[PDB]
Nucleic acid binder design. Structure first.
Ligand SMILES: [Mg+2]
Ligand SMILES: [Zn+2]
Ligand SMILES: [Zn+2]
Lengths: 28, 99, 425, 1337
DNA sequence: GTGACTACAAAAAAGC
RNA sequence: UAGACGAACGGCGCGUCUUUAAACCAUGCGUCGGGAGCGCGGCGGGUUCAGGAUGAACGGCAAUGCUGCUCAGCUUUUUUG
DNA sequence: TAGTCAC
């Protein structure tokens, strides 16, 4: 699927908080 | 040489080595520094704990994956406790003083 | 007896001989090492001995050496080198009286070369050693310079006494860097034979010598004529003049067949002659592995072209035709040996039977009534080789390791013989 | 479940609380059965049930009594894992010592009692006696005694006599004595004392006791009387054949000590005589010490055939200790190792995988999906179905693969790019197809290299993989500045082939609407791949804010350039490709795109460039043949003349005119000149081989020889290789390093003489051996670099600091090697930026300088601006993001939590593979002349001569930019002035290299007085000089008695009087040093500025010892005080040298060797921090006298110069940050917290002082001195005790931490690794921050 | 000053 | 052959005895099994007290049991890369 | 056998 997170970096850019919130959201 | 799940040594609960007898690829520690060079830490956690020498979690993770779950154990690894016990054993008071 | 046997069987200088290639075995036999119990360790090595001394020329090969921590210490000796009765290294030379080379040879020790001057083979001689130029280059003491014709007195024998057999095979070596020569020599060492050898197109001329001198192939001990040919043996009618009186028999040679190497490769000799044709003493009669007509042949001849193509040769990648793999000019044969043992624990002696609890009859179908496979039956991965139970009996039969899957060619069964034998034994 | 760890001694009541019972007998198992006894070592009542959820008698069967005890067997009905941890204790009849404090070199008991352990051991084994105030008047509490003295004192006093024995006596003595009076008396003594050897021990003692009183522990607890016992599982006793056991060493020692305790209990049960009391207690002492650590004192194995038994320490220290080999270095499953190849048809975010390992690795995931679809019913059914590998398994694995990235690495993980992640794509075969471009990043050739692939499990792992380890997200160099997707070898060949232009070919001169139909002509084969076609094309401009305005115009170009403009993205200028594209240029292309368009356009553009490069390079076709390497004709002729001239030079030796050495220099230089001539001839020949006519007349142009394309394109090779293969290969050096006089006149295309080849051999073996040995030292080096900078974690964004001084571009003597803009690129300013335009501020302070503010500097010609730096950050155990600078891996500023130190260490370590282990001045450019440290005197000729050896000269551009820099050797004349606009090629200074002049400062006669003739000055009228010259022999050289006044020539006026420097300093009598070669005879009128005398005077190891701070062979002494320098007295050996500051404690001298040169004179007005001697400089004094900022510049300049000499560039931020960790320690001068001089953590002292000033307003606190310490030693001095215990001297460090009541803050990295807890640096940093923010709040 | 304690894979065999 | 007992119950095994519960061993032989929770009752075990080797009471827990409700191999050495 | 530590 999606292979680049340049969009994530340019607007909500941080490589730890995004990972943890995505993990705790997809856990469900 | 490929290995997903096989036997383990009697002395230590670690897979064997080499193509023969279904060995496991050796994870050195130069690449360990390479790994903590990135911000990735969880992957280091499970590889250190369950992928190598955890036996209860290994079955638990094995039983976790089969029924559509891929969540690790949010706790302190057991090898830390027994080591702590040794420190507690000799003459020394050790504790998780700050929580 | 124990001391000598343990020295032979276990010694850090007693190395394990390499069978995969005639060139490999000859360069392993001709190896020279500065290691062993009495030398120096790899860690404590000094750079002074790592380099090439300017007196190595003519006796010590500057090319043949492995790559790695042990570099420059396991080198070999030159092709024409021979030892000295005092254990030194002594090399041939051609004496020159005034301006003519003396055809007679003369061997020279190492230190004795110090106060001497020796001409080079690349210098041309007119008709009897008369040098084409009276001012020819020469080497005296670790240096080269231009010297007068009468100044020199010794002549090098040829152009070949500077490299060894391990490196002399690589052709057109007059044009490449040392490093690539080193790598090529090492790969020549690590060659593997094929099922049918083909002659190399560009060679050196010593292939016949290296083939005949090593016993990998068959050589005619005595002259005569061929009388009977066989795919496994050779019968030679010795000539009546060549034979010595009293023993008027005829020569027999049993060619060896597919057997295990020391590096999991194959060995066999191919009879390369016919009936009704003369043979001579000291002549090749049957070709061993990776040879033809008594000439060395390691690899194969490819029609090759240099051109970039879609990145499939990105850095050193190679392309191979489905044609060549289709006609099988590269396919090899590997020999695996599996040994299964049966000890005697406290729970009774081990049994090698065929009836084992919790087994499938399909696996037993390829087996016999005692539990050992037949000869020539193909077996796949994970299958059982020989029935064995540990007496409640534990199913400790020998199984095929994964991946490897072929067909049995041979079976060997051994035991302490003075107890009993079973139907298979 | 925690965030910090504290270590301290144990309390016996607390130990009993930890325990769950008391052991009575060593009966671990009973015969005729296999069930342990209730009162034996293996007790269920104390440790738990060996049968899960069952009492021993089995009366309560795991449903009706779950968790409750059994009335018959005192064991709770629970599982077996509690038996892994549940533990008991042993109560000792008499207290025993903890032998570590006995056996430690800093014996804690001995240090606390200030008495060695010899008598202590004797009383421990009841050989000597401990007095306990045996007599109030005669002796004290801390004296040794004997039995006869015990008897003598008993008959002496009897009533007041008392002397108890052994460990109990030691405990009673130490308990009875306090620590307060001790601390006051010790602090009083250290305040007023002069001896220094005992001072260190006294400081250690007071520090230990003052830590002890704060810790709250009790020294008598140190003398333990209850010993804990470990759970039975940790002492494995598997029942062997026939009821045997493995007999673990722990069990034997426990049995021994329990038997000893039982015997002691029996002995005290009948009031036994004291003779056997001592023996029994002593034997129990050896037993308990052997159990604690056997072999340390008595080596009492007693349980084996003369082989040691692991007592307790073997499970702590030694490589058998599980710490650093069981959590550092280990196997792992769920991975595959295999050989690799190139799949040149994949996306950059993909990597191939063959079917067999794919299915083998992912079968656990297959079963989860298999049972999810329900096609298989049981695990065995799925296993046997996948055993046959039906059609369904392929499609289901394809379904599961598409979002499940995998990790990939090579064996030598040199740096950060050694590990990556990829989206798998299934392929056939048994080889790992890899994307071509990333192959450069791994530096992994396809000579047969093996890589290993690993697989994550949890969703967190997959998400962080997608976030970080996607190679798409890893484009720039973490090391210095550049994308690692720089085009590879084959691609740049085709790209260079695109941007060529012949003078005449098919399909040229016409105009084209655009690139769309342009390829149509080429695809139809009706036009050349390269011509001078004119095209009108549309481009886009980022000039508008967020909008790419379009424009178009007709332009002349080549056909291939239109093909490349087809694929170029929107917003790029056209001229970037209008030139002859090269290997270096195309890389910059990507860089420019990264600086405009972002990330996705860059990656897709690079992939498309790779595709087009392969396609057209294959379409074009260019091999290399013999006829390509054309030999220039004149080359042979050239060497002929060289040969001739060489012969001539030989005649010069043959005639005896010259010696061999100068003949050697002549011949080697002329051979080098001939090599240069032939090289330029051949490059000229190959440069313009092609001459093609166009409309009649012929005309030259750039060649299309294959080797010429591999040369000019920059794909591979260099002019050196072409010179070797084509022309003169040159003459190399013999293995000793000396150049042989015989050149090898031939090249590779022609044959070589065997002697030439043999000479060439050992040169290559040298490099091969160096490379082979290089793999060992470098990696170990990297180790020493990561240990010192193990944590270095950013914790907060900005501390508000504004320190640091003048980061400036460096001029390396000649032309500048690196300007300001790139050096300051990526940095964030601290001070506000003032343009040199009278308060016309350009950039505000505390702002990031990425490119735009850097772009604002060139036009303003600003040449010195300071920014933030890690050394100038005053945080606590951390670094500010605004104090470090921009992140290297990403264009935006660095976020929070990342471990910069590890990144810096790996970046510094990686280039080791490229590094081997082993009279006048002329201006060269046009600019203004500037002299720094102006101290000069006008000579008689009217020009200037320097009177200060520290003066330096520079060339400044007329716009203010510094262009040149040259140190002025002492006694150098001047031929120009400051501010004179002088073009290049103009000498300004003159002097002598091997002779240094000493020059008068005032005019007048020289009345030679204040020296002794013959003794001090000798009229050595040599034939060559022919005059009564003055030579001032040294004190050792001349007579001792004569050279006792420091002779000084008396320069005088017309009155013959000792004229002074007018009213200011001192007379003109200049003290002549040793060997002062003076040609003056008597009373010579010598003007000012006229000379008086003429004195006739491994990159990798460099990095290693400059990081080790090892003192060089010559420690250059320096003036650490101000005032006028002087000369000391003369001693037995190295003459003392004294200094004379104008104020303060001026009578300071120092120990100075005299055999080495001393470029110092009496009238040198030295300052605070200028060199006295010359040569290599140790870091210690540079740090200690001229501040931290100066020493940082020196080391970083040295290391970057070494790397640039190797031709490898790395950004200074990484090399600089470890330097900040280099200065992690400081000593104390004015006390108030420490004792007097505690060399300890500088950050801790600073943080203590900063609060103390605001809290204890008025207290001085502590005046400190930030001193350095070797990186190895600094690693040994880590505050994290666990990290120190990881790899060296485990037992000692844990003991010294426990006695001090240490509380490790767990702020490091190795400590998190060894415990296995989540590292609070990467993603775990926020998680730990989140846990503390939400929970425990 | 001087003596004392201490400063990467793969293959093969033994040695248990 | 069968019955009985063998640290609460039952099954089985083993040991003992022949209308005896003992013998035997001594966290009172071994293996396995009990739907749970709440409620009643208490085998067993312990505490207190007394009495002068014994007795009374007691519930923190609790056996066989009962009513109702709810719930689903390692080390060393060597060689090749 | 010398660096560091203790006598
Ligand atoms: Mg390869
Ligand atoms: Zn019980
Ligand atoms: Zn800061």
């Amino acid at each position: 699927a999606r292979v680049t997170v340049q969009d994530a970096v340019e607007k909500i850019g941080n490589r730890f908080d995004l990972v943890l919130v995505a993990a705790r959201r997809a856990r469900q | 040489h490929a290995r997903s799940t096989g036997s383990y040594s009697l002395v230590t609960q670690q897979p064997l080595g080499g193509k023969a007898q279904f060995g496991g690829q050796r994870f050195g520690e130069m690449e360990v520094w390479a790994l903590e060079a990135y911000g990735a830490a969880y992957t280091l956690q499970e590889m250190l704990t369950v992928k190598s020498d955890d036996v209860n979690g290994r079955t638990k993770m094995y039983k976790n994956i089969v029924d559509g779950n891929h969540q690790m154990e949010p706790g302190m690894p057991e090898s830390f406790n027994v080591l702590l016990k040794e420190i507690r054993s000799l003459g020394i008071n050790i504790e998780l003083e700050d929580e | 007896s124990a001391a000598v046997k343990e020295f032979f069987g276990s010694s850090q200088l007693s190395q394990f001989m390499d069978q995969n290639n005639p060139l490999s075995e000859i360069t392993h036999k001709r190896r020279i090492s500065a290691l062993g119990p009495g030398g120096l360790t790899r860690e404590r090595a000094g750079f002074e001995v790592r380099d090439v001394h300017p007196t190595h020329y003519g006796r010590v090969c500057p090319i043949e050496t492995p790559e790695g921590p042990n570099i420059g210490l396991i080198n070999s000796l030159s092709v024409y080198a021979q030892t000295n009765e005092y254990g030194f290294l002594e090399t041939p030379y051609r004496k020159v009286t005034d301006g003519v080379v003396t055809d007679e040879i003369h061997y020279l020790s190492a230190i004795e070369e110090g106060n001497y001057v020796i001409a080079q083979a690349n210098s041309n001689l007119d008709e009897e050693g008369h040098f084409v130029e009276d001012l020819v280059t020469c080497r005296s003491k670790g240096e080269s310079s231009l010297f007068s014709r009468d100044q020199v007195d010794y002549m090098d024998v040829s152009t070949q006494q500077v490299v060894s057999v391990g490196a002399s095979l690589i052709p057109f070596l007059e044009h490449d860097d040392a490093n690539r020569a080193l790598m090529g020599a090492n790969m020549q060492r690590q060659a593997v034979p094929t099922l049918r050898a083909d002659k190399p197109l560009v060679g050196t001329g010593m292939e016949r010598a290296v083939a005949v001198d090593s016993g990998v192939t068959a050589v005619a001990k005595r002259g005569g004529v061929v009388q009977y040919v066989d795919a496994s043996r050779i019968v030679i009618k010795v000539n009546e003049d060549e034979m010595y009186p009293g023993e008027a028999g005829i020569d027999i040679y049993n060619l060896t067949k597919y057997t295990r190497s020391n590096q999991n490769t194959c060995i066999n000799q191919m009879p390369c002659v016919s009936l009704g044709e003369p043979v001579e003493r000291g002549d090749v009669l049957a070709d061993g592995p990776s040879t033809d007509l008594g000439e060395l042949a390691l690899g194969q001849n490819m029609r090759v072209a240099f051109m970039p193509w879609n990145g499939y040769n990105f850095e050193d990648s190679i392309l191979v035709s489905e044609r060549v793999v289709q006609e099988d000019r590269f396919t090899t044969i590997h020999i695996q040996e599996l040994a299964c043992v049966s000890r005697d624990t406290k729970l009774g002696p081990e049994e090698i039977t065929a009836d084992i609890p919790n087994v499938g009859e399909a696996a037993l179908s390829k087996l016999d009534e005692s539990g050992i496979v037949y000869i020539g039956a193909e077996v796949t991965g994970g299958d059982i080789l020989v029935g064995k139970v540990t007496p409640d009996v534990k199913d400790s039969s020998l199984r095929v390791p994964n991946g490897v899957s072929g067909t049995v060619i041979d079976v060997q069964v051994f035991t302490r013989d003075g107890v009993e034998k079973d139907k298979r034994a | 479940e925690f965030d910090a760890i504290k270590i301290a001694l144990a309390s016996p009541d607390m130990i009993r609380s930890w325990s769950f019972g008391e052991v009575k007998k060593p009966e671990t198992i009973n015969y005729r059965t296999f069930k342990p006894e209730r009162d034996g070592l293996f007790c269920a009542r104390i440790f738990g049930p060996v049968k899960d959820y069952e009492c021993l008698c089995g009366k309560y069967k795991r449903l009706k009594h779950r968790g409750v005890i059994c009335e018959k067997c005192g064991v709770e009905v629970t599982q077996t894992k509690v038996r892994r941890e549940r533990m008991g204790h042993i109560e000792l009849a008499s207290p025993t010592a903890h032998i570590w404090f006995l056996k430690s070199l800093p014996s804690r008991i001995g240090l606390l009692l200030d008495m060695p352990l010899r008598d202590i051991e004797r009383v421990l084994y009841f050989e000597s006696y401990v007095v306990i105030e045996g007599g109030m008047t005669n002796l004290e509490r801390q004296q040794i005694l004997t039995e006869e003295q015990y008897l003598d004192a008993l008959e002496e006093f009897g009533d007041e006599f008392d002397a108890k024995m052994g460990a109990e006596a030691i405990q009673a003595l130490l308990k009875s004595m306090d620590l307060e009076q001790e601390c006051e008396q010790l602090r009083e003594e250290l305040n007023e004392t002069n001896s220094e050897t005992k001072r260190k021990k006294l400081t250690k003692r007071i520090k230990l006791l003052e830590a002890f009183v704060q810790s709250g522990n009790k020294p008598e607890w140190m003398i333990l009387t209850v010993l804990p016992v470990l759970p039975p599982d940790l002492r494995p006793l598997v029942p062997l054949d026939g009821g045997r056991f493995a007999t673990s060493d722990l069990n034997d020692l426990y049995r021994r000590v329990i038997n000893r305790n039982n015997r002691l209990k029996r002995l005290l049960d009948l009031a036994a005589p004291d003779i056997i009391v001592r023996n029994e207690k002593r034997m129990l002492q050896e037993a308990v010490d052997a159990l604690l650590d056997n072999g340390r004192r008595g080596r009492a194995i007693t349980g084996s055939n003369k082989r040691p038994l692991k007592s307790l320490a073997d499970m702590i220290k030694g490589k058998q200790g599980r710490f650093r080999q069981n959590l550092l270095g280990k196997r792992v499953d769920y991975s595959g190792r295999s050989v690799i190849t190139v799949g040149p048809y994949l996306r950059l975010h993909q990597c191939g995988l063959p079917k067999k390992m794919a299915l083998e690795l992912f079968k656990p995931f297959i079963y989860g999906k298999l049972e999810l679809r329900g096609l298989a019913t049981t695990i065995k059914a799925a296993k046997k179905m996948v055993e046959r590998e039906e059609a369904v398994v392929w499609d289901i694995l394809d379904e599961v693969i598409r979002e499940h990235p995998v990790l990939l690495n090579r064996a030598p993980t040199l740096h950060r790019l050694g590990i990556q992640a990829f989206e798998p794509v299934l392929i056939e075969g048994k080889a790992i197809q890899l994307h071509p471009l990333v192959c450069a990043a791994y530096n992994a050739d396809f000579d047969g290299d093996q890589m290993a692939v690993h697989v994550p499990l949890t969703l967190e792992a997959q998400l962080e993989a997608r976030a970080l380890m996607m190679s798409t997200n890893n484009i720039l160099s973490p090391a210095n500045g550049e994308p690692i997707i720089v085009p590879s070898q084959d691609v740049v060949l085709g790209l260079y082939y695109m941007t060529r232009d012949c003078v005449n070919a098919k399909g040229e001169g016409m105009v084209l609407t655009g690139p769309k139909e342009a390829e149509r002509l080429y695809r139809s084969g009706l036009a050349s791949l390269h011509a001078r076609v004119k095209v009108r094309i549309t481009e886009y401009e980022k000039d508008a804010n967020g909008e790419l305005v379009a424009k178009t115009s007709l332009k002349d170009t080549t056909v291939g350039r239109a093909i490349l403009w087809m694929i170029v993205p929107k917003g790029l200028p056209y001229s970037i490709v209008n030139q002859a594209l090269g290997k270096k240029a195309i890389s910059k292309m990507l860089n420019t795109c990264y600086r405009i368009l972002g990330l996705k356009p860059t990656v897709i553009f690079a992939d498309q460039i790779m595709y087009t490069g392969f396609a057209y390079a294959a379409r074009s076709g260019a091999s290399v043949g013999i006829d390509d390497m054309v030999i220039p004709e004149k080359k042979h002729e050239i060497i002929s003349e060289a040969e001739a001239e060489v012969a001539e030079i030989q005649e010069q030796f043959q005639s005896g005119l010259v010696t061999a050495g100068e003949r050697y220099n002549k011949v080697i230089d002329i051979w080098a000149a001939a090599n240069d001539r032939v090289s330029k001839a051949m490059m000229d020949n190959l440069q313009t081989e092609t001459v093609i006519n166009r409309d009649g007349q012929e005309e030259k142009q750039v060649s299309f020889n294959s080797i010429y394309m591999m040369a000019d394109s920059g794909a591979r090779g260099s002019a050196a290789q072409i010179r070797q293969l084509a022309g003169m290969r040159g003459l190399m050096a013999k293995p000793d390093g000396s150049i042989i006089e015989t050149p090898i006149t031939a090249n590779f295309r022609e044959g070589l003489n065997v002697l030439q080849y043999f000479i060439s051999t050992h040169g290559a073996r040298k490099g091969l051996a160096d490379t082979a040995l290089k793999t060992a030292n470098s990696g170990y080096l990297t180790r020493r670099l990561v240990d010192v900078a193990q944590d270095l974690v950013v914790t907060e964004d900005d501390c508000g600091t504004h320190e640091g001084i003048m980061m400036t571009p460096v001029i390396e003597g000649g032309d500048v090697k690196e300007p300001l803009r790139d050096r300051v690129l990526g940095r964030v300013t601290a001070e506000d930026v003032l343009k040199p335009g009278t308060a016309d501020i350009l950039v505000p302070r505390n702002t990031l300088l990425h490119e735009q503010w850097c772009d604002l500097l060139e036009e303003n010609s600003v040449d010195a601006v300071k920014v933030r730096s890690v050394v100038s950050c005053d945080t606590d155990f951390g670094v500010c993001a605004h104090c470090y600078g921009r992140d290297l891996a990403r264009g935006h500023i660095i976020n929070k939590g990342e471990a910069i130190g590890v990144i810096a260490a790996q970046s510094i370590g990686e280039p080791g593979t490229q590094l081997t282990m082993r009279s006048s001045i002329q201006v060269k450019n046009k600019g203004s002349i500037k002299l720094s440290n102006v101290k000069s005197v006008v000579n008689s000729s009217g020009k200037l001569v320097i009177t200060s050896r520290n003066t330096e000269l520079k060339l400044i551009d007329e716009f203010g930019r510094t262009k040149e820099s040259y140190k002025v050797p002492y006694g150098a004349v001047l031929a120009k002035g400051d501010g004179e606009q002088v073009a290049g090629g103009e000498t300004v200074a003159n002097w002598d290299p091997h002779t240094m002049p000493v020059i008068t400062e005032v005019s007048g006669f020289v009345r030679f007085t204040d020296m002794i003739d013959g003794q001090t000055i000798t009229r050595q009228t040599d034939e060559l000089t022919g005059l009564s010259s003055l030579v001032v022999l040294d004190s050792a050289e001349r007579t001792a008695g004569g050279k006792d006044l420091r002779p000084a020539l008396k320069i005088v006026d017309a009155q013959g009087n000792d004229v002074l420097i007018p009213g200011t300093d001192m007379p003109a009598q200049y003290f002549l040093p040793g060997k002062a070669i003076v040609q003056l005879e008597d009373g010579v009128q010598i003007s000012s500025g006229d000379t008086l005398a003429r004195i006739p005077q491994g990159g990798l190891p460099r990095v290693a010892d400059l990081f080790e701070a090892r003192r060089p062979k010559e420690p250059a002494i320096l003036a650490e005080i101000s005032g006028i320098v002087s000369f000391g007295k003369e001693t037995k050996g190295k003459r003392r040298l004294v200094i004379t500051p104008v104020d303060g404690s001026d009578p300071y001298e120092e120990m100075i060797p005299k055999w080495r040169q001393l470029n110092v004179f009496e009238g040198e007005r030295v300052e605070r921090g200028d060199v006295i001697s010359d040569g290599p400089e140790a870091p210690h004094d540079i740090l200690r006298l001229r501040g931290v900022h100066a020493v940082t510049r020196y080391i970083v300049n040295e290391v970057q110069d070494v790397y640039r000499l190797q031709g490898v560039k790395i950004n200074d931020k990484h090399i600089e940050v470890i330097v900040r960790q280099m200065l992690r320690k400081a000593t104390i001068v004015n006390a108030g917290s420490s004792d007097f001089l505690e060399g300890e953590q500088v950050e801790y002292s600073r943080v203590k002082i900063a609060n103390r000033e605001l809290e204890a307003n008025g207290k001085v606190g502590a005046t400190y001195s930030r001193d350095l310490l070797g990186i190895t030693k600094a690693s040994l001095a880590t505050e994290s005790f666990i990290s120190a215990a990881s790899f060296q001297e485990t037992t000692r460090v844990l003991t010294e931490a426990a006695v001090a009541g240490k509380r490790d803050e767990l702020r490091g990295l190795k400590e998190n690794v060894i415990v296995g807890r989540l590292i609070p640096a990467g993603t775990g940093y926020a998680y730990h921050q989140d846990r503390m923010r939400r929970r425990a709040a």
